[PDB]
Amino acid sequence: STENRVIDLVVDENVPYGLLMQFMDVDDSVYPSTSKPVDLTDFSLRGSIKSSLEDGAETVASFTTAIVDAAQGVASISLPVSAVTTIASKASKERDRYNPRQRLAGYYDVIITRTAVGSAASSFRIMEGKVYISDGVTQ
Amino acid sequence: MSTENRVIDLVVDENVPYGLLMQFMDVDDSVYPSTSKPVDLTDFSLRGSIKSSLEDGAETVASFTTAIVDAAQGVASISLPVSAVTTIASKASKERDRYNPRQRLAGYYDVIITRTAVGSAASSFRIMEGKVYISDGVTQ
Amino acid sequence: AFYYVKRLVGDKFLNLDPETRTPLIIKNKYVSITFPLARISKRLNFSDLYQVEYDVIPTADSDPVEINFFGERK
Amino acid sequence: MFYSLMRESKIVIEYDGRGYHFDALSNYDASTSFQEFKTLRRTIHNRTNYADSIINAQDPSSISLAINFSTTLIESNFFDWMGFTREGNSLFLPRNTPNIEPIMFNMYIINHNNSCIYFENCYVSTVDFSLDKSIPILNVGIESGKFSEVSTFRDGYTITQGEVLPYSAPAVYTNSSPLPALISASMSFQQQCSWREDRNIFDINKIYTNKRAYVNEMNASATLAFYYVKRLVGDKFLNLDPETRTPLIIKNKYVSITFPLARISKRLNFSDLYQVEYDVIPTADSDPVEINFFGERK
Amino acid sequence: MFYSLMRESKIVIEYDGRGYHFDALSNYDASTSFQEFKTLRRTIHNRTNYADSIINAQDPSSISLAINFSTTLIESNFFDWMGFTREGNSLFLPRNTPNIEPIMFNMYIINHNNSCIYFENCYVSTVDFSLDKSIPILNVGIESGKFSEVSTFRDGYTITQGEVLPYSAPAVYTNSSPLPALISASMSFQQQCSWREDRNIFDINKIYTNKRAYVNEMNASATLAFYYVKRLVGDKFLNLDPETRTPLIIKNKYVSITFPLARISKRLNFSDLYQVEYDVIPTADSDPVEINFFGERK
Amino acid sequence: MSLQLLRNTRIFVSTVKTGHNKTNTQEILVQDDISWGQDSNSTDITVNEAGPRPTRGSKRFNDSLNAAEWSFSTYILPYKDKNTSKQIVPDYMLWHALSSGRAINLEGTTGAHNNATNFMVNFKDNSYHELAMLHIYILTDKTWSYIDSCQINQAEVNVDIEDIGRVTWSGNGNQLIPLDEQPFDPDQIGIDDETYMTIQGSYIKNKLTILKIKDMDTNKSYDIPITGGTFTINNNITYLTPNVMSRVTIPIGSFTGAFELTGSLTAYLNDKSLGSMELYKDLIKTLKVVNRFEIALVLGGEYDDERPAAILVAKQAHVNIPTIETDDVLGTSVEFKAIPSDLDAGDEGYLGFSSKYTRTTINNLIVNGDGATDAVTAITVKSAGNVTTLNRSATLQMSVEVTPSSARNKEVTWAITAGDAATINATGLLRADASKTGAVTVEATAKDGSGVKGTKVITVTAGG
Amino acid sequence: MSLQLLRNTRIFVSTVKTGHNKTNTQEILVQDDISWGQDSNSTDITVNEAGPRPTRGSKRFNDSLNAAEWSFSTYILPYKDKNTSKQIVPDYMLWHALSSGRAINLEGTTGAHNNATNFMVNFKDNSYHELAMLHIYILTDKTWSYIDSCQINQAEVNVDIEDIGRVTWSGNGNQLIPLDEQPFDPDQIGIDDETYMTIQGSYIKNKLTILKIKDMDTNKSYDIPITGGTFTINNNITYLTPNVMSRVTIPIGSFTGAFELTGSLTAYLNDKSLGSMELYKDLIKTLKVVNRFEIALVLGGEYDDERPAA
């Protein structure tokens, strides 16, 4: 368990990217952990892809948040193929050790937010990590 | 007979407000089992400050905002707004650590709970201590 | 086998508590054994430099354990 | 990040609310582990491959310390905590074990950057040292029930071991007649306790730690190694016959273990130079075994 | 005083009233010990700490001798004492064990200044020697019942081992066809006796020593090590199949152990150079196993 | 039909196996002691029988090849190049492959990076299992050859007085490969006469060697005239070779060991103040498990006018307990090891090479880490309005003036040392109270670690 | 502000750390090969990881100090002193601390004891775990120092013909301590010119070396002209140092080993009666596990008129 916010995204060159997050609320009080999904009301997600963590870093791209099926908790984060091309343009020429197709493009993090659901701006970061562009061959 | 854990290291998130709440509970070990009643925080105030070093003359990075949430349940919350988080992020050490470039050392913090009144004794108490770290964020 | 390393006082990520389910992967440039969910038990040895030792087995309901074989260029 | 070096450590034993920092520590060894219940439920329906393992208990820790003798004699507290009665600077082995449960204490293993490992519910289970031609050192062995990681701790600034005692050759006597050709006198003292496992159904879904224990027995023992030496033909003093009761003392300039009456068994080895080996235990009705601790000038 | 050096010793075996001083002794090992009955009577009244130990028996001694081959062949008496029948200079393994009890003899280990250790009621329980590329030597193993310290003794001035036999390469044959690529031929002979403990209530308050024993079995065995060698494709003579009955002889210039019919089991090891290992025992109806002792010129 | 002489060998260091240009390959001026090669392992299988007519025959198998060994010695020859006008040592890529495992970037701040003032090498970025990868090219007369995928194992520097400053390189390679065709024209890549003149203008003589040692636990600088010494940069690199029974194998990859920066310094015993005898007596009287010494070995000497020099700096060093070397003149040996503050921090030490070191340049290299970044030299603290005293319940916000005026770190800290009659804050706003009739002091020190002192005795009185 | 030369070293041997007089301390005339010191032990703790971006850093700890080593060579210089009129060697307390573990008593009969005829050293009273305890005082030019609680480990004597009779001492001490103040006036304690003349009157030349060997099992004295040899008096003394992880330690006590008195004697083969060839042939013909020989090596030769000898 503990914390696992750090996960790295590998986006594909020349292909639009879309991620599907099934938000969930597991509780291990009872031995079969409760599968209750969180209910997505007054929730907005924001995420930017910025090269390096230093202050003043240029914004490589910005995630486009989608909220669908609020009852069952799922949500989608995506960005158009034009955003993918803009990301791939500024990616470094050095390739990842384990995969000779990925190149480090920047860092990211998405931040959930409650906007005055109880007169509170309860915004906290969901996940984080590095964004990797995977060089394509089709185009 | 056991040990306390006054030394706690906090990790804040850049561009996000940080909220920590402490509950003070009275305890006792007797013939009947452990009886716990919340401590009534009346005339109880908190105050915390952050400096970049322990040595005298250290630059004050920021200070924490203190509040009491529920006296009957003995809950007090110690936190700082997002602007203070940004202020501490600016003043943090620039030295990164591999395997996790996010965290940077920000300084040392202390929290004193005090009860000041004419009939009350001038008693302070350092409830905690430790170091403050920052998880750098890219959004905002 | 690791070295006992802690980054914070009272750290939560790195400690000696057991982990009922956690995704683990022992990765190389040519092979990667994946445990979709793992049961980790820790053991500390007070040797010349403190060493912690894990005992990783897949959980009851974990997905099949992966063993990838990359020849060259993954 | 912060690595943890054994050489950069400090071991403090917490007893009665006071910290006994045991300096002059040559070497210590410890380990922590957990107990699992791993069963594989292979059925005719599904011959599964994935076990059902849950961590439910902490395996008791076995900590061993090697401590040099010191001028302030803090190390005699290990005999004191292990059950011996005290009069002045001499420790008696009581005729009967005083209490059912041993003397429990906590122990810290401090390290830099507020790092610590907290062993709780410990008891001294073994103490043995060899009086030989090398510097004497007593290896103590304690068993813990619960181990934990804590931020702040207890550090024995004042209660500490002084300078190590200078070497002095051992000598074993019978009354006041010296025993010739000594090789190595090894003394052993034990408090063979046993953990009382009380893991019950109220501890399901929880980690269990041993808390209570009882003393099976205490004992004092010594193994003496000599060279097979005879002064007369058909000698009576030095031979291989057993000795039901004989007063023995393994004496040094700083320590003297006394057996008011001893049961000696002899064993001859036909090695390069013939060696006899004694097995000294106190008799049934013998007076309490003495262990004197002389700091300086007796 | 008088120390006891192993190099300054003399081992004399007393049989039939004659002393067999076994010179050409490379090395011997022996030990003496006593048996104790140590019980701790912990009661609800007094949870005592002092045991009730009484020495009541002498643990049987296990003496091992390593004796070089000699020109006078005194060492064949160990086969003679262990139970083999004698005809000339050749020792037969009898089809049936002759007597229930082994052949008992006493042994002295002499040292300077009238010092001695007297092992009594001994019997030869093991004899094995390895014919190899080093000088052959047979390690005999005898077990004693009673050990004692005596002033005067028996010293074999005349009966003694002569000069050691010169080395000669071993060779193993089948009838008269040599077996190629020998590495190490090890022979083993045993008289697996057992002590009959008859400690009774009439021996209370006394030290008991074992006195009588019976032979469980005698046997002759040999382990042969070869290199895996084949001369033909699909060879019949040299292979890994077991051989129910085949005449074998492990021959030397001074000794020849003969198996009139042998049961051979083979074992192949895929080592740096492939090695096969035999396990030679005589068959059910095989004629008595021969052991010839040639001093010089056969 | 020709014999090849060792005197005609020429060594080129490359980071690429193709596209050789002046930024990837340069000649390395080597000496007589150059050596290279590759050894092979074998095995004999012998039958060991015991019978008569035994088999007496053996058989040999080639089983593996060892890692290629190479070594050579070069002179420490700092100079400034005309193209970039930045001080650089000709064998700079050797220093880089020794220092860090990243791609070479002289414009950066880690590993081998140069400047308009000096050439610098720091080990702050050597946490890699495979450091920067070189390819040594060997040209003997006409035939070519090279060692594939080399790694700089160590660099020996022997401080041998009455001799020139020299460094000995050692390392290992995967395989030594003989080349039949010319990889690159050695005439163009090799150093020309102009840069040769520029280099020979600058030589480092080991005789003019000053040493700067200071006990950080006591603030005691010693004056130790050296007799002879040496320091090493060691990587403990081990090359892994696979074991295959059917075919011979060559090493496939390597793994760097523990980075060690040790040294040994011999000097005569001096009875003068802060001499060798005082250091030896202090070290054998303290008997401490750990030592914190600052060691700055300055090859080539320090002078007001511009001189060449090579400097090794160990900020937090560890000094062994010295021993007395009984010779015709009594002496001692100061064996040290540069340890880091934290294991995974690097920064065990650094080096600075240049043909232009004024004393101030080496001083600010030692105390700031770079020869270009100026460092404070002296301080006199100033009050608020040239005030000489203070009365009870009065503030005194004191200021500071520093020299030089171009120091990078112009800030100071504040403290009270002697007397208890006032308190000071971070900014310097000294505050007092009543019942203060004693003389109190105030102090200030810079944050760059120069060791500059700012003192003032203010005569605080009870007032009129 | 001065450099110290080895040629100005002066060595004094003492049994007391205070109250230094002429009966507790005397100067020992040493040679060029004098040496002393003390070495220290350490340890490096290195992290050995396997992953990419591994930690490459070490750390050193001082853990213990070794026993101090000292050695020097002196000439065998017997003479008679004017005060007692008994033959005595100047480095007699060295011989005593080598020979016995009791307090020095030249009037006795064990260890180093003298007489009106000769100075004698026997090892009849060396059954001690800690022999007589000395303190070597070293004076180099102006600065003082000494080794605390030394013990004579061995004494090498090399019979090197065409050279003077000399003995080489070796030993160990608990700790080498540098002294800032003068312990005793070296002018008074040091040997004066009169005793120097008396000593230089008597020298032992290794060339004039007769050897007396006799087989006690056969009563056969041999005439062996020596070519070169050596004999040693060895104590095999080992110094014990405690192991403490938190603080460095110095040796605390010692324990003497097995006392060995060996030798080696080279000579040419002689065909004459009772020569080297006869001894060699007898020894290789008997082939006995034990031998009983009487050996009396006489340095300086034997003569009717008075001559020095060891």
UniProtKB/Swiss-Prot annotation, chain A:
Descriptive protein name: Collar protein p132
RNA-binding as UniProt keyword: no
Alphabetic keyword roster: Late protein, Viral tail fiber protein, Viral tail protein, Virion
GO cellular component: virus tail, fiber
Species annotation: Escherichia phage T5
The organism's place on the tree of life at top rank: Viruses
Summary of the function given for this chain in its UniProt record: Forms the collar, into which the side tail fiber protein pb1 is anchored.
Keyword Translocase: no
Subcellular location: Virion
Assembly mode: Homododecamer. Interacts with baseplate tube protein p140.
Major localisation: virion
Record Pfam families: LtfC
UniProtKB/Swiss-Prot annotation, chains D, E:
Top-level taxon of the source organism: Viruses
Annotated GO CC locations: virus tail
InterPro entries: Baseplate_tube_p140 (IPR056389)
Keyword annotations: Late protein, Viral tail protein, Virion
Main location class: virion
Short name of any one Pfam family annotated for the protein: Baseplate_Tube_p140
Cell location: Virion
Keyword check for Lipid biosynthesis: no
Function per UniProt: Forms the simplified baseplate, together with the p132 collar protein ring and the cone (DTP-pb9 and BHP-pb3).
Subunit note: Homotrimer. Forms a pseudo-hexameric ring. Interacts with collar protein p132, DTP-pb9 and tail tube protein pb6.
UniProt-recorded name of the protein: Baseplate tube protein p140
Annotated organism of origin: Escherichia phage T5
From Swiss-Prot, chain F:
Stored Gene3D superfamilies: 2.60.40.1080
Subcellular location: Virion
One Pfam family this sequence matches: Big_2
Biological process terms in GO annotation: symbiont genome ejection through host cell envelope, long flexible tail mechanism; viral release from host cell by cytolysis
InterPro entries: Big_2, Invasin/intimin_cell_adhesion
Major subcellular location class: virion
Domain BIG2: 375-453
Swiss-Prot/TrEMBL keywords: Late protein, Viral genome ejection through host cell envelope, Viral long flexible tail ejection system, Viral penetration into host cytoplasm, Viral tail protein, Viral tail tube protein, Virion, Virus entry into host cell
Domain of life per record: Viruses
Residue ranges of the region described as Disordered: 40-59
Annotated GO CC locations: virus tail; virus tail, tube
Known function: Polymerizes to form the tail tube of the phage. Tail tube protein polymerization takes place around the tape measure protein (TMP-pb2) and is probably directed by chaperone proteins. The tail tube is involved in viral genome delivery during ejection.
Subunit structure: Homotrimer. The tail tube is made of 40 stacked trimeric rings. Interacts with baseplate tube protein p140.
Recorded domain comment: The C-terminus possesses an Ig-like fold of the Big-2 family.
Record protein name field: Tail tube protein pb6
Species: Escherichia phage T5 (Enterobacteria phage T5)
Name of the gene: N4
